[PDB]
Ligand binder design. Structure first.
Ligand SMILES: N#CCc1ccc(O)cc1
Length: 544
């Protein structure tokens, strides 16, 4: 079938959308843009086509193996009150007379509607359920993406998703997929696994595989396969009917209504904005890629999967033979309707592989031992940091980034420095901020960072020191490219910030001591002082 059919009604904005900044961070303000509904038509072209899927024996053996593991999972229905509490405070309000706040407070009005939306699921496994369709506002840097398309149901139904399926998507993927399930790894757990599976090969070769617009490629068959997988769990029979209902009425497809209540058409592929999207896309990607490995007679594959993002580390068979096996791999994905975006490439250096927007690189600790840590090109982080300082958004990527990328050259010299500067100047150190980790919202007190980082990356994150030539040049380049003060200017800014931090005592002093010891010249000596990197919930409307 067609991934989407369109009526012609436009995808419409909710309010005024900014596509530009209105400066101590970066001078090239004209290089940073946000996507808007003005690019919707273009994204619409990219994401719509007919899907021709052809399964094979490898697909069925992997599935049968996945089903066997899934059958050992037992999972419980969630109550209204547990599901309510998981709803973020600023989730989109219902069109039936209530908002997230009412939900979170167990207002009998929201809860009654939730009850009646559940009953209807139990009674009706057929009528497609309505979705809103919207163009996302995401900041990027020049060199231009069309907005991505977010699709999601009413709050009422979201709460019910949590009821039927929160336990399933939190628990199953790890069990079905073992060490291949990416969202079980904190950043240092993730480097840990990758580096060890790399060294475990005799003659290693790795590749990432970018699937072209994954959500579009996910077929209605795919989503029932996914369901059948969920169905193998030992489920309470009321969860069983809700799950059949939700997949048939929402996950499989349905009508697309825009911000003004007009009909834009009909989706027959993955909604980005539903509970099962991450889990589903991971299962579906792991399944299809596991089979593509078997087709291409790739030897001794270890895989790592995070939604549509896929890495494979395996035994090389020579460079010709590799390049070819990759072409066979690609051909099979394509048959399974997960065609290529960038055509995949063999790498023989773990550092050059990019997966989950990230790569392994190596630094040294105080003692001089070698430490592997996880980094990325800092462009999008810096851009969005410049955006976030300019226009006050309720979302704070800088902080997530500091948390995910705390050992890096750039998060430490640039992000830590800049933002502790804003917070000191604004007297807002003590204020918690919401940030997103694997699609769940957490409230985080910026003063806790020292502990947080020690816990997630160890003590060495405060003293890594001979970063690699490739890393340094990427960061230095990105800086010139974007118009950001070079690294030596951040050193002098950090000495200033550290000092102000220290004079305040308490936890601000701890932040200054630990976060900024790289900047001093004579080092102080640094002694010691969750449910976070467990699952993927992006699109999933989850709060903690
Ligand atoms: N750190 C980390 C992993 C990660 C980063 C960004 C993203 O969209 C998904 C996963």
């Amino acid at each position: 079938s067609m991934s989407y059919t369109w009526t012609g009604a436009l995808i419409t904005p909710c309010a005024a959308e900014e596509s530009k900044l209105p400066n101590s961070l970066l001078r090239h303000h004209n290089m940073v843009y946000a996507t808007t509904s003005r690019s919707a038509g273009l994204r619409q072209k990219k994401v719509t086509f007919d899907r021709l899927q052809v399964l094979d024996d490898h697909y069925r053996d992997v599935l049968k193996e996945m089903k066997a593991k899934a059958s050992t999972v037992k999972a419980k229905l969630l109550s209204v009150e547990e599901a309510c509490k998981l709803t973020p405070p600023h989730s989109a309000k219902s069109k039936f007379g209530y908002g997230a706040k009412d939900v979170r407070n167990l207002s009998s009005k929201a809860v009654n509607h939730i009850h009646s939306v559940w009953k209807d699921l139990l009674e009706d496994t057929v009528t497609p359920i309505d979705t809103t369709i919207m163009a996302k506002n995401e900041v990027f840097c020049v060199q231009r993406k069309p907005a991505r398309l977010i699709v999601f149901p009413d709050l009422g139904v979201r709460v019910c998703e949590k009821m039927a399926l929160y336990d399933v998507v939190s628990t199953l993927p790890q069990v079905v997929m073992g060490s291949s399930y990416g969202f079980q790894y904190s950043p240092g757990q993730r480097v840990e696994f990758l580096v060890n599976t790399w060294k475990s090969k005799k003659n290693p070769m790795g590749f990432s595989y970018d699937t072209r617009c994954f959500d579009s490629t996910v077929t209605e068959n795919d989503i029932r396969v996914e369901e059948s997988i969920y169905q193998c769990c030992d489920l309470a029979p009321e969860a069983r009917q809700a799950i059949k209902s939700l997949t048939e009425r929402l996950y499989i497809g349905g009508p697309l209504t825009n911000s003004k209540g007009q009909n834009c058409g009909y989706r027959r592929c993955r909604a980005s904005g539903v509970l099962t999207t991450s889990c589903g896309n991971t299962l579906t990607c792991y399944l299809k890629a596991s089979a593509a490995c078997r087709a291409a007679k790739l030897q001794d594959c270890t895989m790592l999967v995070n939604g549509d993002d896929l890495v494979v580390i395996c035994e090389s068979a020579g460079t010709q033979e590799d390049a070819a096996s990759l072409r066979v791999f690609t051909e099979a994905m394509t048959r399974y309707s997960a065609p290529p975006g960038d055509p995949p490439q063999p790498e023989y250096d773990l550092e050059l592989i990019t997966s989950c927007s990230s790569n392994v690189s190596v630094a040294h600790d105080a003692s001089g031992k070698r430490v592997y840590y996880l980094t990325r090109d800092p462009t999008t982080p810096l851009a969005r940091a410049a955006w976030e300082t300019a226009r006050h958004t309720p979302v704070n990527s800088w902080l997530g980034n500091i948390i995910m990328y705390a050992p890096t050259l750039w998060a430490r010299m640039i992000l830590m420095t800049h933002f502790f500067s804003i917070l000191l100047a604004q007297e807002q150190l003590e204020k918690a901020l919401d940030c997103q980790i694997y699609g769940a919202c957490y409230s985080i007190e910026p003063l806790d960072l020292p502990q947080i980082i020690e816990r997630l990356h160890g003590l060495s994150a405060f003293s890594l020191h001979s970063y690699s030539p490739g890393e340094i040049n990427r960061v230095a380049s990105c800086l010139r490219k974007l118009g950001v003060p070079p690294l030596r200017v951040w050193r002098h800014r950090a000495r200033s910030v550290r000092a102000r931090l220290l004079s305040q005592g308490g936890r601000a002093a701890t932040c200054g001591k630990y976060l900024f010891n790289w900047a001093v010249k004579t080092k102080l000596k640094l002694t010691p002082i969750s449910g976070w990197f467990v699952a993927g919930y992006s699109g999933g409307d989850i709060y903690h």
